[PDB]
Symmetry: D2
Subunit: 326 residues, 4 copies
């Protein structure tokens, strides 16, 4: 049986409430070996080893843990046959894309969480964690970039996103679809991500202890330019605009980010709209203002790429190319 | 034939590019009578009169235009049999909910836009505008609150939202579904919004020239508390948190909004997640920090209600009740 | 606590299997007592009387079980506070609609099943049962017709359909959306069905012990009319066509059915297309051939309403108006 | 500019109607020249040779037109740069899959239709045609199999299906997502089909002028096996079952088909459920009865692959492996 290392970071998959019937719970309580012992059938499909990296609710995920996960996955890559990362659902779509771009290891990395706590009735963590190692063990899962496995479905780390606040079926690749479906511990893979990932990227965080500062501003009717200017005043390396519609900006935010871009801040236009690309050649003349168009990357995903792009260049057209390739 | 007044504000429905084949265009160019003359079959179903309120791209929509629209709709209510508001798609879901809560007139108000410019091949504006007056003319459309009509579908102004950056079918009531479908100028209505609206609300903006200041902060891995503190320092009456998952907050943003709430700022927890409620009784003790849980209201919709709630009270539990009722 | 009668008919919620990690299992085998005992937390919210009606896979469901269920509910209506029906998921949408038209009890009737069998890992049946009882217990669930509660969602019996072959979240009201969502044992209702149901229908199943025979025929490329004739030589009271697109029929099947509509057998146009209404005034002149267009009712749900409409009149224009109101 | 052959078979893209505001219309009436002339902007991107193959409503589509289309494409393959096929939307998913398995040309084959007829307001056919030609013209569209381009989206022939009866956005690859989106006449491809298509299949339609007879039977509550026997006494080479749930069959239909699978006629288990795979190792022992599980192929698409698999072998275990690879 393959060697599968589990890397625990926290989440509701490791959370607990005082009742199987009530909704109140605290996140990231359960230790990693407790998670594994709850699913004794893991011994049938893999030889599992658990390591605790952190134990937090993923609403507190940060640059520090991202670097830690990437380096540990890269350096211990030949010690095991695959990795499963237990993680909170709240930001798992951010971590999954960050590792998608910084993991040089060639063996499958699968992220899992749970939408119901360990203690809840019909908790989903157990079958989720099982199906994650079924995926990390499958040699067919290799060469697909970093994966997210939830609700009997394998999802690529670029497009996967949390679509619903409470539903067990919340995670979807809302733009390009899942890579394959899990039935009875077997996977029928019919897709792979075309965008470049893992060792195919030039992002090397192995010597990095920081990440460039990138923030996100929201656009809406009558939006304040103060969030944008606060990030400008703090000397942020990049700002991601969660625009309206096809990446559009309220006029005052427009004015602020246009000025920051000419004075050196990298500005990426994404959108609050849950599906579809922020394109070029719509209402905003990106070439003129040195803006970068995020494509199908939502704001928090656009932040992941813009941070890593900023470790390579500060030229907007170089960054636009990175946003067209990864 | 019924009297239908069209109130034009701008949008891509009134936008133009130099080619039916290229995607570049400027928004809010076309005058309101030009829109009507493009659809001469309007004369078959209604006696239409057009008035120009503004001509902007709805990414620039603001409190000023909202007040103007509400007052004009309220005071001219008995002059016509129905209203159709042509409007940009980018923020139409915000205007539609604002009018949903401030319109005292009892006759149908229908908002329309277009995802392709007037000049584009297979432009959608014409049939959209037609189907909007078909809806404003139908007496069955009354008593349903303010409506949004797009792609042969009637949508309630609370739940309707822009789901895709470019698709003609972008607008959906992603939580509770549409009220009815349009076929051949007839509507088969099978639903109506349970939440209270229009004259059933206590919101009266008829003497108001301002709206309370409410901003929106985004949550993500490693999020800066600077947007939140900038809005605090400006003395904002309310802040809407676009949380992660079920309304959760990054720890530093948490700290800032908890403090603002105890010192008088109204704080509403919404979510970046495109569907589903930000509930109470999950990970955040709302009663303790005087936070308000937004339910199914997304951040920009939660801003609309919190602004209007702030014209009635500053007590968090009074505001939570408003968020449970409207 | 309220008195809740659980009526058990089988399903994979009562389904077996030799292993929590394998899919091979048998359906409709566990009894209602073992189902109730498996969820002891029912004892705190409701007073559940388990009654076994039959114990079958719902793929083998039929008119008999339908009739007995409708009778049993109407008879026992005033000796309980609500009903829960445990059912297989394959045909749950048809039973739910049948009872949605036949039951005359004005108290909640809620159906529930499970997509994973009792013995599987992370099995969904227990929380499903719990939430179904919560809904049957809720005062607000009355007067909304027969309900289906699955995956934390309350779905009206008319529009609810099985959307996916294996997903725990398979049930959706794909046309008009759900009625409300269940969180922490509380429901927030924001919709009710507009079509007449339960108590305001004219159907009366009380005396009948057999139901007019209606079959279903599938349109496709190079469709054979052998199934369509097979049902008319056997003298079926009516046929429902699973047409292509907007309820259109192939060459052969069109002719066989146009013969039939004139010589007695009432035929109904529905569609194999999972969402959207079969409209009249499209390609097919229903008035010319005496056809009936089903609207949003899919084929298995069109058969339910025709069977029953055939117990009232065989006039096509009489039937169409029942399809426009129920 | 590239040479693009447009092959016209009809559809509501060639459909009539007396009024832009009414739905009554007739299908497959406009010729290919009037279709091309209606989109003069084609002249700038492609060199379109219009060829009329037939002019029919695709509800009346059949094997003949399929065979002639496959032959015509394979024969003329090297006298053009790509093919566009204008088609009705009702059966477009079946033709697209047939050709996806039969054509041996390694140049783009793209199908297109319209949900609104040529003469309607805001008719979608022109931009649809334009974008289909864009896709047929694109160098990157080769080696992805037969494509369907509808509503600015490139969809693989296998998974694409008509999702809604009237929506202009009805076509979706409901299981694995689309291949790419078209904006401003450029496509961003991020997926290709993994299942073997076009040139790497073993099918050869060149000599054949008739196709093994396969019918489809619909499972539901109290299902009649009269359609299922009708096809076996008429000696059909195989039947596809539109089963309930995960490809399950009613009492009667199970027995008739278990008889059949043994006495020659190969039967295939598919499902009436719009999304998700009919799996083996569930409730039905396919190995015991010599059944075949279709996977994600819906019924009309299972019939396409069986018809063709029946021109190769009648062994069930031979057929299942073709269903696991094509
Ligand atoms: N707040 C939790 C939510 C979850 O895990 O589902 C987390 O992300 O850790
Ligand atoms: N930016 C435009 C987009 C549209 O109308 O579709 C607007 O909202 O006015
Ligand atoms: N075959 C099962 C399907 C299920 O319950 O999930 C039934 O309907 O009984
Ligand atoms: N009945 C039409 C449907 C369409 O094209 O929209 C056809 O398939 O030809």
């Amino acid at each position: 049986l393959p060697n599968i290392t589990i890397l625990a970071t926290g989440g509701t998959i490791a959370g607990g409430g005082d009742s199987a019937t009530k909704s109140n719970y605290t996140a990231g309580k359960v230790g990693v070996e407790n998670l594994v012992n709850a699913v004794p059938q893991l011994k049938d499909i893999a030889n599992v080893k658990g390591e605790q990296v952190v134990n937090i609710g993923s609403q507190d995920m940060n640059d520090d843990v991202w670097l830690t996960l990437a380096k540990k996955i890269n350096t211990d890559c030949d010690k095991t046959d695959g990795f499963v990362i237990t993680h909170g659902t709240d930001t798992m779509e951010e971590t999954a894309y960050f590792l998608d771009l910084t993991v040089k290891c060639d063996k499958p990395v699968v992220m899992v969480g749970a939408m119901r706590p360990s203690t809840s009735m019909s908790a989903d963590g157990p079958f989720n964690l099982y199906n994650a190692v079924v995926t990390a063990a499958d040699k067919a899962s290799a060469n697909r970039g970093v994966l997210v496995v939830m609700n009997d479905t394998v999802l690529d780390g670029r497009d996967v996103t949390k679509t619903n606040t409470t539903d067990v079926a919340t995670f979807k690749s809302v733009n390009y679809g899942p890579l394959g479906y899990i039935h009875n511990g077997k996977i029928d893979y019919q897709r792979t991500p075309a965008r470049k990932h893992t060792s195919d990227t030039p992002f090397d965080v192995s010597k990095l202890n920081e990440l460039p500062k990138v923030g996100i501003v929201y656009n809406y009717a009558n939006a304040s330019d103060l969030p944008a200017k606060a990030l400008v005043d703090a000397g942020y390396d990049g700002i991601v605009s969660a625009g309206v519609g096809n990446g559009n900006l309220y006029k005052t935010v427009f004015d602020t980010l246009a000025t920051a871009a000419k004075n050196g801040t990298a500005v990426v236009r994404s959108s609050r709209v849950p599906t579809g690309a922020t394109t070029q050649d719509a209402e905003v003349d990106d070439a003129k203002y040195g803006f970068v168009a995020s494509g199908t990357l939502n704001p928090q995903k656009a932040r992941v790429l813009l941070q890593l792009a900023l470790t390579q260049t500060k030229d907007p057209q170089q960054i636009q190319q990175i946003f067209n390739q990864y």
